[PDB]
Design a protein around this ligand. Structure first.
Ligand SMILES: *C(=O)/C=C/c1ccc(O)cc1
Length: 125
Protein backbone atom coordinates (compact mmCIF):
# COMPACT_ATOMS: atom_id res chain seq x y z
CA UNK A 1 0.00 0.00 0.00
CA UNK A 2 1.22 3.63 -0.65
CA UNK A 3 0.65 5.44 2.67
CA UNK A 4 -1.09 8.78 2.14
CA UNK A 5 -4.30 9.79 4.01
CA UNK A 6 -7.38 11.06 2.19
CA UNK A 7 -7.66 14.81 2.67
CA UNK A 8 -3.99 15.35 3.66
CA UNK A 9 -2.97 19.03 3.48
CA UNK A 10 0.10 18.34 1.26
CA UNK A 11 -1.48 15.57 -0.84
CA UNK A 12 -0.55 17.25 -4.17
CA UNK A 13 3.17 17.25 -3.20
CA UNK A 14 3.04 13.59 -2.21
CA UNK A 15 1.33 12.45 -5.37
CA UNK A 16 3.63 14.49 -7.68
CA UNK A 17 6.24 11.67 -7.43
CA UNK A 18 3.88 8.86 -8.37
CA UNK A 19 3.68 7.01 -11.71
CA UNK A 20 0.45 5.18 -12.59
CA UNK A 21 1.67 2.03 -10.78
CA UNK A 22 2.23 3.86 -7.49
CA UNK A 23 -1.15 5.59 -7.81
CA UNK A 24 -2.69 2.08 -7.83
CA UNK A 25 -1.31 1.52 -4.31
CA UNK A 26 -3.44 4.24 -2.76
CA UNK A 27 -6.20 3.56 -0.15
CA UNK A 28 -8.71 5.74 -2.08
CA UNK A 29 -9.81 6.55 -5.62
CA UNK A 30 -7.70 9.04 -7.53
CA UNK A 31 -8.39 10.62 -10.93
CA UNK A 32 -6.18 13.26 -12.61
CA UNK A 33 -8.01 15.64 -14.99
CA UNK A 34 -6.78 18.32 -17.36
CA UNK A 35 -8.46 21.74 -17.38
CA UNK A 36 -11.09 20.49 -19.85
CA UNK A 37 -12.02 17.50 -17.65
CA UNK A 38 -10.23 14.82 -19.75
CA UNK A 39 -8.94 11.88 -17.76
CA UNK A 40 -5.08 11.67 -17.53
CA UNK A 41 -4.74 9.08 -14.67
CA UNK A 42 -7.32 6.83 -13.02
CA UNK A 43 -6.30 4.40 -10.32
CA UNK A 44 -7.29 0.90 -9.33
CA UNK A 45 -9.17 1.88 -6.11
CA UNK A 46 -11.38 4.17 -8.20
CA UNK A 47 -12.21 1.29 -10.58
CA UNK A 48 -13.07 -0.87 -7.51
CA UNK A 49 -15.56 1.77 -6.35
CA UNK A 50 -17.24 2.53 -9.70
CA UNK A 51 -16.75 -0.52 -11.89
CA UNK A 52 -14.92 1.31 -14.65
CA UNK A 53 -11.83 -0.27 -16.16
CA UNK A 54 -8.97 2.21 -15.43
CA UNK A 55 -7.16 1.66 -18.77
CA UNK A 56 -10.26 2.23 -20.81
CA UNK A 57 -11.35 5.58 -19.40
CA UNK A 58 -8.00 7.34 -19.83
CA UNK A 59 -8.53 9.99 -22.50
CA UNK A 60 -12.28 10.23 -22.06
CA UNK A 61 -13.96 13.33 -20.77
CA UNK A 62 -15.11 12.90 -17.19
CA UNK A 63 -18.08 15.30 -17.31
CA UNK A 64 -19.35 14.62 -20.78
CA UNK A 65 -18.64 10.85 -21.32
CA UNK A 66 -17.82 8.96 -18.12
CA UNK A 67 -19.72 10.70 -15.29
CA UNK A 68 -22.78 12.62 -16.54
CA UNK A 69 -24.23 12.58 -13.00
CA UNK A 70 -21.44 14.98 -11.99
CA UNK A 71 -22.49 17.46 -14.72
CA UNK A 72 -24.22 19.78 -12.28
CA UNK A 73 -23.46 22.99 -10.54
CA UNK A 74 -22.61 20.98 -7.38
CA UNK A 75 -19.69 19.11 -8.90
CA UNK A 76 -18.72 20.26 -12.49
CA UNK A 77 -19.67 23.84 -11.61
CA UNK A 78 -17.15 23.75 -8.73
CA UNK A 79 -14.50 22.25 -11.05
CA UNK A 80 -14.83 24.78 -13.80
CA UNK A 81 -14.78 27.68 -11.28
CA UNK A 82 -11.51 26.23 -9.90
CA UNK A 83 -9.95 25.87 -13.37
CA UNK A 84 -10.96 29.45 -14.31
CA UNK A 85 -9.54 30.82 -11.06
CA UNK A 86 -6.35 28.78 -10.98
CA UNK A 87 -7.12 27.45 -7.45
CA UNK A 88 -9.32 24.65 -6.19
CA UNK A 89 -9.64 22.81 -2.90
CA UNK A 90 -13.05 21.51 -1.95
CA UNK A 91 -14.48 18.43 -0.24
CA UNK A 92 -18.13 17.31 -0.37
CA UNK A 93 -20.34 14.26 -0.39
CA UNK A 94 -21.98 13.08 -3.57
CA UNK A 95 -23.90 10.13 -4.98
CA UNK A 96 -22.60 8.32 -8.10
CA UNK A 97 -25.51 6.64 -9.89
CA UNK A 98 -24.85 6.29 -13.59
CA UNK A 99 -25.14 2.72 -14.83
CA UNK A 100 -24.15 1.49 -11.38
CA UNK A 101 -25.66 0.84 -7.97
CA UNK A 102 -26.08 4.28 -6.34
CA UNK A 103 -22.96 4.75 -4.25
CA UNK A 104 -22.45 7.58 -1.72
CA UNK A 105 -18.88 8.95 -1.68
CA UNK A 106 -16.74 11.72 -0.25
CA UNK A 107 -15.03 13.68 -3.03
CA UNK A 108 -12.00 15.94 -2.65
CA UNK A 109 -11.03 18.11 -5.70
CA UNK A 110 -7.65 19.85 -5.55
CA UNK A 111 -5.37 21.56 -8.06
CA UNK A 112 -2.26 19.56 -8.81
CA UNK A 113 1.27 20.95 -8.46
CA UNK A 114 1.71 20.10 -12.21
CA UNK A 115 0.76 22.74 -14.76
CA UNK A 116 -2.93 22.56 -15.83
CA UNK A 117 -4.07 19.51 -13.94
CA UNK A 118 -6.54 18.73 -11.20
CA UNK A 119 -7.09 15.82 -8.86
CA UNK A 120 -10.35 14.17 -7.88
CA UNK A 121 -10.07 11.87 -4.85
CA UNK A 122 -12.90 9.61 -3.81
CA UNK A 123 -13.68 7.37 -0.85
CA UNK A 124 -16.74 5.46 0.33
CA UNK A 125 -18.90 6.90 3.13
C1 LIG B 1 -22.21 9.87 -12.25
O1 LIG B 1 -22.48 9.74 -13.50
C2 LIG B 1 -20.81 9.38 -11.80
C3 LIG B 1 -20.09 8.53 -12.49
C4 LIG B 1 -18.70 8.17 -12.11
C5 LIG B 1 -18.00 8.74 -10.97
C6 LIG B 1 -16.66 8.44 -10.77
C7 LIG B 1 -16.05 7.53 -11.67
O2 LIG B 1 -14.75 7.19 -11.44
C8 LIG B 1 -16.70 6.96 -12.78
C9 LIG B 1 -18.04 7.31 -13.02
Amino acid sequence: MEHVAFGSEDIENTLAKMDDGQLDGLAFGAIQLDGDGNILQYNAAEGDITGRDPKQVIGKNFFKDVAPCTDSPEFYGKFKEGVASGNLNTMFEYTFDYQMTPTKVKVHMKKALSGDSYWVFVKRV
